[PDB]
């Protein structure tokens, strides 16, 4: 009984991944008793907006005192973590079915907390509050009781008016792919769940910058790989290894149709979107064209490839590169009109192969 | 919605058939914009919706004439396309079909009118046909369309097509009255409206001045090569109407290379000349098109950068002008 | 009408509260603070009721009169805030304002707020009426005083903000005063110390991890690495593609016109003429010097396709093209 | 009598162009293999419902279940008239049905009054209101022996896979000449005066539907003289003038002046610009056919014969293709053009320039 | 009395073809009881979106218990496979005349299930739901009862607001030609029905990755070939027999015009699909081009025409073969603009003849 996402909910500032200058600021303020009436947390859905707000509410209320290091044991900490604390009043302007809506809940703001130092209102997606209640929040911030704190959080800060932005301390939350992978690697290990290094990368890439997502993606990966997190089950949803996209061009400019077709059949067996493959090739030949005028053309994940591209950039004439770029360009346009999409590709390459500079086809 | 003078000869024979019985229960009128297409339909229905007509026109008193002057009437049915969309619905049609299937509230003739039949849904066409096949006794229909070919052959067969532009000499004189301008200009407007005197008139109501700005810019650029100077003249919400203007000038220069007598821009023959002088008939073709396709992306696509697109059209025009460049050829 | 700067308000307010305060400008922060400064002083007096009415070219004379009735029949100290239209007062508004201006007295403080009025809109019966009784606060800081403003704002936050650091903060968030203020406040939590040295500030600014302008500023023949970095770091701040294309376009078409004017006028006067040269000059010219008349062109086609590709399939992953576009502004292209 | 009604095919023998779809129904009836439900697809106009009838006609008939239904028995007469007790017809497009599908599908399991089958012909089945829709599925997977379902729809895609899988669906696909040829045959046997170009104009106007083809042929007989004449036909629909040809003749000599002239006169008579281009393409085509086998000049085209052939022998086929191509393209870009006429001028001037031995450039 | 489209209508999760990973996914949850309140099934029409949705509801309400292996006999199982079930409400958001549109049927949601355990809601293409009934779904999804579950389908997942996507467990349903062919052969082999392999490939191509349609297509073929799925019965529903098509290609290359128009006329007689006559000729030209590269290129059923394909291959210059393929393709681009389909095809050919490389149409 334990799902990784739930089991690794951060219990302290100390263990949230990489938002250092947000955490320090909050942690210093929490040690010097410097706390503003309201804080706005912004960032794409996924980063721990609400999650950091908890640890801060958790910080302001831990029975030990006001601290940057709440003990995860006292009742306040335990309840806030389970999200069932009297005083950590949590709203979500996002839904249409709340029992008593924000306006009603915000009405009693001046009522002292029933437990713990502060009454903390945590509102998700404030930019979604109906105007009826939004104004209720606006009035409260102009004159907020010293016993209440507003921990607001939003996906779209722009949509908020200056009226509110001027009355909160904004904190934006930025994750690095190699940052997420290291964390996935760790969670699985503590969970004794089998995994291949390539697999976690195919996931880290997938979840766009957010752990929340990586976790749910891995949870799905598990259920489909039935226990394991293998590149195959992970490549079942999130492929690129089977892609001769660069090895097809190599094979092309090298002239061994034998290989060129073998690649295409191989690719076919995997169910490729034929036009995308011609895009990958056209987008590659264009970049190799660029490394020939300036070597600073090697990218953020060009690394594995690096040597393979760098070899082409020097051993292939720019005239010939243009020639191949054109042949694949034309073959892309002709594609949807071919009798069959695979056929287009096969023939497009056969054209490069027929109009090749070195070793073109023979005739008696 | 203003009754013009040229609408008379046509209006004469159209009542002359509704009086002698020869009237065709379905009428498709084809006419250029601002040719009074508007006023002819309306003027005809007021004759048929009169309880006590005085001969060629109505009385003004009778229930028909009054509810007519009040607009709202139980026998007049305006079939305007669905408010918001650029087409008409199969629904509107069906609901007016069955609306006529029951006795006329004022006991007489019932009339229907379409804004433009070439804008309806394909299904809307068929849905309309069956009724013209089963004509509810003494009813009347009025189709109307700028382009009757883009209309279903089986449909345009059921109606009587009637061609509504008056001779240029007449249109110019009529125009000299509504606005004082050189006749030379007047004719240009007329020709830049396919002969429609109404649209011509509207060309002036600060448009013409805006058009003069264009020819001045063009006259600078043509000999100088700096076509990018037109940016100020073209980059404006009226970009499409302006691009079209620039096109007519391009056409003309093209026509002159083939020694074509007729020219739309009589307003400034000196321009079309120089233009044709500095630009080969091919170069001209090339530009004509880009101006053409680019004008369209402005009209069609929801919201591109008027500025970027045009800047691109402009700079691009200049590369066609450079020696050695291989200009474009149409597709598909 | 004492014309004055946001800083000057608190001192004047001490001598005596005036009849009307007009807050004319575009800065959200400046307007609000001045507004707050007036009211904070008023509510101290006895100004309990507060009101705000927004004037549109669409508002009825019946609304103006209805308001007058509201203000005129209320017996004690009250305040009224007129929110001027986005465009500014039209021919008709000048009258409705004028009618309101005749609703004043010592116990009815008027506050009007909007952007800067044009020298024309300033002759208007309503404006000239308050011209002896009221105070005007210009809420609109130029390249030279942006740093000065940051230094002033920082010093009141009890901060020792170094000059280089100050500049760093300025070159990042250039012009978004709300950002510079937050940043100063965040920077204060980071170093409780108070001592904002360049090393410290630099670390925290870079670590926080960019204006869509930094992409362009980088894209100006500056090495692609950092622009590609910023471009792929601009998808992490939640920046729409469309808003990027119109930032590139504006600076790109500007280069087009300028490169076109060599022998038309020496670079110097041209920059003044276009009114954007605000340090960007040396950078803009550095760009002009290594981008060929033709490169600049090609970059315009790409931007155009993208502009259509983004508006014809309405979801064709323009980002890719933005990457490809940023690459053309640094390397010599071909005719393919 | 109107040739729209009088020629309703009475047997599969006289249906036109659906060859396979009838080979499967003729064999189905012959051997005795009749399925629970038949789903007929295709655009409006094609024999969907017509071929539907002929099926029930081959089922209910007193001479047995044969692909060859007797046309005289009491069942057939009543089927074709469209007034049969067991052949219930429900049009799902109408808002005023007496007892909507739900009530007519209520009686399903009941015996057939006159006949072996109680056939159900439903036109536009995808338009059915939901609560009756499933009622079919109660019957479809377990339908009685005496009931049969004949379904028709302009669009299959709007029918849930629950139904598309339980039925043996047939897609009804006519070339112009195919219709032209039938019209002729009807007018010959009917002894009515007809011209060649008329039958062409008539066929092309009916877009692949013999149904409409005849309905147009009938309005040509009423509008014109009781003669299907070119004059009448192009009176409902065409310039009826040698304009398309002379335009081609000018174009190919590189006359411009005259090409632009013709375009103008043309414009003055309110021509449908696309129709003009289509004629030109058609002309350019026959020519190339004549260049390949000199017998290609057809029926009313005897009027042009000399002119047509003169082009055939004087203009390079290589070129003839070029003109065709250039005009075709023109037709696509036609609505792209600011004005339909300038579109046509854009094109023809285009063929004049990209003219071997034609307009050249200067300073 | 049975058309394959119904006789092979998947009864078990095992019977469905190739979409292993979406079946596995649903297998786990139907075993572990991990039921999500909303299941989104995306992919083109023709793929088993609705079909796989049934086999889920067939294991949700089954009297045998929540199973991944439903019993085809229990009253619940039979009624589900027949479209009619008390609780399985199937709403098509693309229909214009529903008794009561989605907003009405969703009003009941809170109500209890009369026969089954769950009150399943199969909705095909929800991105086309009226904005009115769309919000009703939103409100019911944020807080759905324990008894109600949703099974959403769609052809375009992008037209669905992120507010909905995030609330469902999404599944993308992606078939190959020889994956359908192989299926069709198997099914025909088990029904003891004769067939020719080149007929099956045509049927496998006919339906594009739509096994429903493949079967529907195979039933027509049976009805019109009187018990046999023969190329001569199939080729005719759709496209020329590779000999009919092959002679055209030969006619063209020998440059004898009469013969070409004759084959086209003789072809019109058996009611072709003019577009198709172009396609088969293109592919035929394509195979000849390949064979000139690797003589091993020809497919297995090509053997009937293998001697002719091979002859052209060695006798006709690849250059020429490239022209014929281009002429015919370009001719396909033209086709919708040609005055008449049959004509576009004749003209495209008369061009190949006029521009023939070894001999062409002459003039004085």
GROMACS .gro file of C-alpha atoms in nm, chain C:
model
  336
  697UNK     CA    1  -0.233   7.301  -1.081
  698UNK     CA    2   0.088   7.195  -0.916
  699UNK     CA    3   0.233   6.956  -1.173
  700UNK     CA    4   0.441   6.695  -0.996
  701UNK     CA    5   0.617   6.358  -0.985
  702UNK     CA    6   0.503   6.054  -0.777
  703UNK     CA    7   0.785   6.122  -0.534
  704UNK     CA    8   0.677   6.478  -0.477
  705UNK     CA    9   0.321   6.388  -0.365
  706UNK     CA   10   0.380   6.290  -0.002
  707UNK     CA   11   0.548   6.624   0.075
  708UNK     CA   12   0.273   6.834  -0.088
  709UNK     CA   13   0.004   6.623   0.073
  710UNK     CA   14   0.148   6.735   0.408
  711UNK     CA   15   0.091   7.104   0.347
  712UNK     CA   16  -0.270   7.055   0.249
  713UNK     CA   17  -0.509   6.823   0.067
  714UNK     CA   18  -0.630   6.992  -0.253
  715UNK     CA   19  -0.960   6.991  -0.439
  716UNK     CA   20  -0.875   6.739  -0.703
  717UNK     CA   21  -0.594   6.506  -0.785
  718UNK     CA   22  -0.561   6.386  -1.142
  719UNK     CA   23  -0.335   6.076  -1.182
  720UNK     CA   24  -0.244   6.070  -1.550
  721UNK     CA   25  -0.029   5.795  -1.689
  722UNK     CA   26   0.035   5.435  -1.783
  723UNK     CA   27   0.221   5.284  -1.489
  724UNK     CA   28   0.004   5.047  -1.283
  725UNK     CA   29   0.224   5.076  -0.982
  726UNK     CA   30   0.270   5.450  -0.992
  727UNK     CA   31  -0.101   5.523  -1.035
  728UNK     CA   32  -0.192   5.293  -0.740
  729UNK     CA   33   0.065   5.428  -0.500
  730UNK     CA   34  -0.031   5.789  -0.568
  731UNK     CA   35  -0.396   5.693  -0.539
  732UNK     CA   36  -0.321   5.518  -0.207
  733UNK     CA   37  -0.123   5.821  -0.085
  734UNK     CA   38  -0.418   6.055  -0.149
  735UNK     CA   39  -0.678   5.831   0.015
  736UNK     CA   40  -0.459   5.736   0.310
  737UNK     CA   41  -0.447   6.110   0.381
  738UNK     CA   42  -0.818   6.156   0.323
  739UNK     CA   43  -0.952   5.869   0.535
  740UNK     CA   44  -0.745   6.031   0.808
  741UNK     CA   45  -0.966   6.340   0.777
  742UNK     CA   46  -1.312   6.189   0.783
  743UNK     CA   47  -1.353   6.065   0.431
  744UNK     CA   48  -1.560   5.753   0.495
  745UNK     CA   49  -1.744   5.713   0.168
  746UNK     CA   50  -1.535   5.636  -0.135
  747UNK     CA   51  -1.666   5.604  -0.492
  748UNK     CA   52  -1.541   5.523  -0.841
  749UNK     CA   53  -1.723   5.582  -1.170
  750UNK     CA   54  -1.580   5.491  -1.509
  751UNK     CA   55  -1.641   5.722  -1.805
  752UNK     CA   56  -1.683   5.564  -2.152
  753UNK     CA   57  -1.773   5.727  -2.481
  754UNK     CA   58  -2.072   5.496  -2.435
  755UNK     CA   59  -2.198   5.625  -2.097
  756UNK     CA   60  -2.539   5.800  -2.085
  757UNK     CA   61  -2.605   6.156  -1.978
  758UNK     CA   62  -2.863   5.986  -1.762
  759UNK     CA   63  -2.580   5.808  -1.580
  760UNK     CA   64  -2.397   6.138  -1.526
  761UNK     CA   65  -2.705   6.301  -1.381
  762UNK     CA   66  -2.789   5.991  -1.178
  763UNK     CA   67  -2.440   6.011  -1.032
  764UNK     CA   68  -2.471   6.380  -0.956
  765UNK     CA   69  -2.780   6.305  -0.756
  766UNK     CA   70  -2.592   6.045  -0.559
  767UNK     CA   71  -2.299   6.275  -0.474
  768UNK     CA   72  -2.510   6.587  -0.413
  769UNK     CA   73  -2.761   6.436  -0.174
  770UNK     CA   74  -2.496   6.272   0.049
  771UNK     CA   75  -2.431   6.483   0.357
  772UNK     CA   76  -2.072   6.421   0.462
  773UNK     CA   77  -1.711   6.384   0.361
  774UNK     CA   78  -1.687   6.153   0.062
  775UNK     CA   79  -1.448   6.077  -0.225
  776UNK     CA   80  -1.505   6.015  -0.595
  777UNK     CA   81  -1.271   5.845  -0.840
  778UNK     CA   82  -1.327   5.903  -1.210
  779UNK     CA   83  -1.165   5.636  -1.426
  780UNK     CA   84  -1.085   5.791  -1.765
  781UNK     CA   85  -1.124   5.581  -2.085
  782UNK     CA   86  -0.841   5.382  -2.230
  783UNK     CA   87  -0.814   5.610  -2.533
  784UNK     CA   88  -0.871   5.930  -2.340
  785UNK     CA   89  -1.174   6.167  -2.318
  786UNK     CA   90  -1.357   6.233  -2.646
  787UNK     CA   91  -1.558   6.538  -2.754
  788UNK     CA   92  -1.866   6.427  -2.557
  789UNK     CA   93  -1.682   6.318  -2.241
  790UNK     CA   94  -1.525   6.663  -2.199
  791UNK     CA   95  -1.879   6.781  -2.122
  792UNK     CA   96  -1.981   6.502  -1.884
  793UNK     CA   97  -1.658   6.562  -1.697
  794UNK     CA   98  -1.734   6.934  -1.700
  795UNK     CA   99  -2.077   6.868  -1.551
  796UNK     CA  100  -1.914   6.661  -1.279
  797UNK     CA  101  -1.644   6.918  -1.215
  798UNK     CA  102  -1.926   7.145  -1.102
  799UNK     CA  103  -2.019   6.905  -0.832
  800UNK     CA  104  -1.716   6.988  -0.615
  801UNK     CA  105  -1.661   7.147  -0.278
  802UNK     CA  106  -1.443   7.099   0.024
  803UNK     CA  107  -1.622   6.784   0.137
  804UNK     CA  108  -1.614   6.604  -0.200
  805UNK     CA  109  -1.255   6.506  -0.303
  806UNK     CA  110  -1.225   6.425  -0.672
  807UNK     CA  111  -0.963   6.193  -0.810
  808UNK     CA  112  -0.942   6.135  -1.179
  809UNK     CA  113  -0.710   5.874  -1.321
  810UNK     CA  114  -0.603   5.766  -1.666
  811UNK     CA  115  -0.312   5.787  -1.896
  812UNK     CA  116  -0.140   6.106  -2.007
  813UNK     CA  117  -0.375   6.360  -2.175
  814UNK     CA  118  -0.286   6.512  -2.501
  815UNK     CA  119  -0.202   6.883  -2.515
  816UNK     CA  120  -0.545   6.914  -2.686
  817UNK     CA  121  -0.745   6.719  -2.427
  818UNK     CA  122  -0.577   6.961  -2.182
  819UNK     CA  123  -0.749   7.278  -2.307
  820UNK     CA  124  -1.090   7.119  -2.233
  821UNK     CA  125  -1.339   7.309  -2.015
  822UNK     CA  126  -1.325   7.034  -1.748
  823UNK     CA  127  -0.945   7.034  -1.721
  824UNK     CA  128  -0.904   7.411  -1.715
  825UNK     CA  129  -1.171   7.432  -1.446
  826UNK     CA  130  -0.963   7.240  -1.188
  827UNK     CA  131  -0.647   7.414  -1.310
  828UNK     CA  132  -0.627   7.638  -0.999
  829UNK     CA  133  -0.777   7.415  -0.736
  830UNK     CA  134  -0.615   7.078  -0.823
  831UNK     CA  135  -0.285   6.887  -0.838
  832UNK     CA  136  -0.158   6.672  -1.128
  833UNK     CA  137   0.063   6.370  -1.065
  834UNK     CA  138   0.244   6.238  -1.369
  835UNK     CA  139   0.244   5.861  -1.336
  836UNK     CA  140   0.439   5.747  -1.640
  837UNK     CA  141   1.135   5.610  -1.588
  838UNK     CA  142   1.361   5.665  -1.888
  839UNK     CA  143   1.684   5.471  -1.952
  840UNK     CA  144   1.888   5.716  -1.743
  841UNK     CA  145   1.654   5.721  -1.443
  842UNK     CA  146   1.540   5.357  -1.443
  843UNK     CA  147   1.857   5.282  -1.244
  844UNK     CA  148   1.801   5.593  -1.036
  845UNK     CA  149   1.445   5.478  -0.958
  846UNK     CA  150   1.567   5.132  -0.862
  847UNK     CA  151   1.823   5.293  -0.632
  848UNK     CA  152   1.560   5.515  -0.475
  849UNK     CA  153   1.305   5.233  -0.430
  850UNK     CA  154   1.576   5.004  -0.296
  851UNK     CA  155   1.706   5.258  -0.050
  852UNK     CA  156   1.367   5.292   0.110
  853UNK     CA  157   1.351   4.913   0.141
  854UNK     CA  158   1.664   4.959   0.353
  855UNK     CA  159   1.887   4.810   0.086
  856UNK     CA  160   2.254   4.868  -0.005
  857UNK     CA  161   2.214   4.803  -0.379
  858UNK     CA  162   2.549   4.815  -0.564
  859UNK     CA  163   2.570   5.001  -0.894
  860UNK     CA  164   2.670   4.712  -1.115
  861UNK     CA  165   2.409   4.497  -0.943
  862UNK     CA  166   2.155   4.774  -0.994
  863UNK     CA  167   2.238   4.766  -1.362
  864UNK     CA  168   2.204   4.390  -1.376
  865UNK     CA  169   1.859   4.413  -1.227
  866UNK     CA  170   1.784   4.685  -1.485
  867UNK     CA  171   1.905   4.494  -1.790
  868UNK     CA  172   1.681   4.208  -1.676
  869UNK     CA  173   1.310   4.309  -1.638
  870UNK     CA  174   1.398   4.630  -1.830
  871UNK     CA  175   1.094   4.849  -1.778
  872UNK     CA  176   0.867   4.627  -1.571
  873UNK     CA  177   0.877   4.828  -1.252
  874UNK     CA  178   0.646   4.583  -1.078
  875UNK     CA  179   0.912   4.319  -1.141
  876UNK     CA  180   1.202   4.535  -1.017
  877UNK     CA  181   1.015   4.600  -0.695
  878UNK     CA  182   0.922   4.232  -0.634
  879UNK     CA  183   1.276   4.139  -0.722
  880UNK     CA  184   1.411   4.385  -0.471
  881UNK     CA  185   1.176   4.244  -0.208
  882UNK     CA  186   1.264   3.884  -0.292
  883UNK     CA  187   1.636   3.974  -0.294
  884UNK     CA  188   1.584   4.107   0.056
  885UNK     CA  189   1.457   3.773   0.182
  886UNK     CA  190   1.757   3.598   0.025
  887UNK     CA  191   2.015   3.822   0.184
  888UNK     CA  192   1.867   3.937   0.517
  889UNK     CA  193   2.208   4.096   0.539
  890UNK     CA  194   2.096   4.393   0.332
  891UNK     CA  195   2.419   4.404   0.134
  892UNK     CA  196   2.315   4.356  -0.232
  893UNK     CA  197   2.649   4.318  -0.399
  894UNK     CA  198   2.694   4.238  -0.767
  895UNK     CA  199   2.807   3.875  -0.705
  896UNK     CA  200   2.507   3.810  -0.483
  897UNK     CA  201   2.251   3.977  -0.706
  898UNK     CA  202   2.403   3.829  -1.014
  899UNK     CA  203   2.380   3.476  -0.878
  900UNK     CA  204   2.016   3.507  -0.774
  901UNK     CA  205   1.908   3.671  -1.100
  902UNK     CA  206   2.064   3.413  -1.319
  903UNK     CA  207   1.955   3.129  -1.089
  904UNK     CA  208   1.590   3.244  -1.088
  905UNK     CA  209   1.594   3.177  -1.460
  906UNK     CA  210   1.379   3.634  -1.927
  907UNK     CA  211   1.198   3.901  -2.124
  908UNK     CA  212   1.098   3.795  -2.477
  909UNK     CA  213   1.325   4.087  -2.560
  910UNK     CA  214   1.628   3.905  -2.416
  911UNK     CA  215   1.565   3.653  -2.693
  912UNK     CA  216   1.574   3.926  -2.954
  913UNK     CA  217   1.847   4.124  -2.777
  914UNK     CA  218   2.038   3.797  -2.806
  915UNK     CA  219   1.903   3.732  -3.150
  916UNK     CA  220   2.070   4.047  -3.284
  917UNK     CA  221   2.369   3.861  -3.430
  918UNK     CA  222   2.461   3.767  -3.074
  919UNK     CA  223   2.552   3.397  -3.053
  920UNK     CA  224   2.261   3.157  -3.105
  921UNK     CA  225   2.354   2.938  -2.811
  922UNK     CA  226   2.211   3.180  -2.557
  923UNK     CA  227   1.914   3.273  -2.779
  924UNK     CA  228   1.828   2.906  -2.826
  925UNK     CA  229   1.874   2.873  -2.450
  926UNK     CA  230   1.648   3.172  -2.380
  927UNK     CA  231   1.400   3.052  -2.644
  928UNK     CA  232   1.372   2.712  -2.478
  929UNK     CA  233   1.365   2.888  -2.139
  930UNK     CA  234   1.083   3.112  -2.268
  931UNK     CA  235   0.856   2.810  -2.297
  932UNK     CA  236   0.911   2.766  -1.921
  933UNK     CA  237   0.765   3.101  -1.824
  934UNK     CA  238   0.449   3.028  -2.020
  935UNK     CA  239   0.504   3.268  -2.311
  936UNK     CA  240   0.271   3.230  -2.610
  937UNK     CA  241   0.434   3.188  -2.950
  938UNK     CA  242   0.227   3.463  -3.114
  939UNK     CA  243   0.349   3.721  -2.865
  940UNK     CA  244   0.705   3.624  -2.954
  941UNK     CA  245   0.657   3.663  -3.329
  942UNK     CA  246   0.532   4.019  -3.290
  943UNK     CA  247   0.835   4.107  -3.075
  944UNK     CA  248   1.069   3.971  -3.338
  945UNK     CA  249   0.876   4.131  -3.618
  946UNK     CA  250   0.889   4.475  -3.467
  947UNK     CA  251   1.266   4.464  -3.419
  948UNK     CA  252   1.320   4.281  -3.752
  949UNK     CA  253   1.126   4.521  -3.976
  950UNK     CA  254   1.310   4.798  -3.790
  951UNK     CA  255   1.639   4.653  -3.898
  952UNK     CA  256   1.504   4.631  -4.252
  953UNK     CA  257   1.432   5.002  -4.269
  954UNK     CA  258   1.758   5.099  -4.110
  955UNK     CA  259   1.990   4.877  -4.318
  956UNK     CA  260   1.802   5.026  -4.610
  957UNK     CA  261   1.912   5.369  -4.503
  958UNK     CA  262   2.288   5.357  -4.542
  959UNK     CA  263   2.389   5.663  -4.746
  960UNK     CA  264   2.040   5.794  -4.665
  961UNK     CA  265   2.164   5.934  -4.335
  962UNK     CA  266   2.450   5.834  -4.101
  963UNK     CA  267   2.336   5.570  -3.847
  964UNK     CA  268   2.344   5.833  -3.571
  965UNK     CA  269   2.047   6.059  -3.660
  966UNK     CA  270   1.846   5.764  -3.790
  967UNK     CA  271   1.823   5.601  -3.446
  968UNK     CA  272   1.687   5.924  -3.296
  969UNK     CA  273   1.437   5.934  -3.579
  970UNK     CA  274   1.305   5.590  -3.494
  971UNK     CA  275   1.298   5.665  -3.119
  972UNK     CA  276   1.397   5.316  -2.993
  973UNK     CA  277   1.778   5.375  -2.984
  974UNK     CA  278   1.794   5.384  -2.599
  975UNK     CA  279   2.122   5.194  -2.536
  976UNK     CA  280   2.027   4.943  -2.804
  977UNK     CA  281   2.263   5.154  -2.995
  978UNK     CA  282   2.571   4.985  -3.052
  979UNK     CA  283   2.385   4.654  -3.043
  980UNK     CA  284   2.141   4.752  -3.320
  981UNK     CA  285   2.429   4.875  -3.529
  982UNK     CA  286   2.635   4.571  -3.445
  983UNK     CA  287   2.344   4.380  -3.593
  984UNK     CA  288   2.323   4.600  -3.899
  985UNK     CA  289   2.692   4.547  -3.961
  986UNK     CA  290   2.697   4.174  -4.003
  987UNK     CA  291   2.351   4.101  -4.143
  988UNK     CA  292   2.342   4.138  -4.521
  989UNK     CA  293   2.062   4.319  -4.698
  990UNK     CA  294   1.967   3.973  -4.822
  991UNK     CA  295   1.992   3.787  -4.489
  992UNK     CA  296   1.750   4.032  -4.341
  993UNK     CA  297   1.515   3.950  -4.624
  994UNK     CA  298   1.520   3.572  -4.581
  995UNK     CA  299   1.448   3.619  -4.217
  996UNK     CA  300   1.137   3.805  -4.324
  997UNK     CA  301   1.003   3.514  -4.533
  998UNK     CA  302   1.050   3.267  -4.252
  999UNK     CA  303   0.877   3.494  -4.006
 1000UNK     CA  304   0.595   3.519  -4.262
 1001UNK     CA  305   0.551   3.142  -4.319
 1002UNK     CA  306   0.554   3.094  -3.943
 1003UNK     CA  307   0.304   3.378  -3.914
 1004UNK     CA  308   0.075   3.188  -4.151
 1005UNK     CA  309   0.164   2.832  -4.041
 1006UNK     CA  310   0.057   2.950  -3.696
 1007UNK     CA  311  -0.266   3.090  -3.834
 1008UNK     CA  312  -0.362   2.841  -4.108
 1009UNK     CA  313  -0.335   2.504  -3.925
 1010UNK     CA  314  -0.373   2.696  -3.596
 1011UNK     CA  315  -0.149   2.459  -3.404
 1012UNK     CA  316   0.150   2.340  -3.623
 1013UNK     CA  317   0.430   2.373  -3.359
 1014UNK     CA  318   0.566   2.706  -3.456
 1015UNK     CA  319   0.827   2.671  -3.182
 1016UNK     CA  320   1.029   2.460  -3.422
 1017UNK     CA  321   1.034   2.742  -3.677
 1018UNK     CA  322   1.126   2.993  -3.405
 1019UNK     CA  323   1.432   2.781  -3.341
 1020UNK     CA  324   1.504   2.773  -3.712
 1021UNK     CA  325   1.442   3.146  -3.733
 1022UNK     CA  326   1.681   3.231  -3.449
 1023UNK     CA  327   1.944   3.036  -3.640
 1024UNK     CA  328   1.916   3.248  -3.955
 1025UNK     CA  329   1.998   3.572  -3.773
 1026UNK     CA  330   2.347   3.444  -3.687
 1027UNK     CA  331   2.473   3.238  -3.986
 1028UNK     CA  332   2.495   3.316  -4.360
 1029UNK     CA  333   2.210   3.146  -4.552
 1030UNK     CA  334   2.177   2.990  -4.898
 1031UNK     CA  335   1.924   3.011  -5.185
 1032UNK     CA  336   1.758   2.679  -5.096
   0.00000   0.00000   0.00000
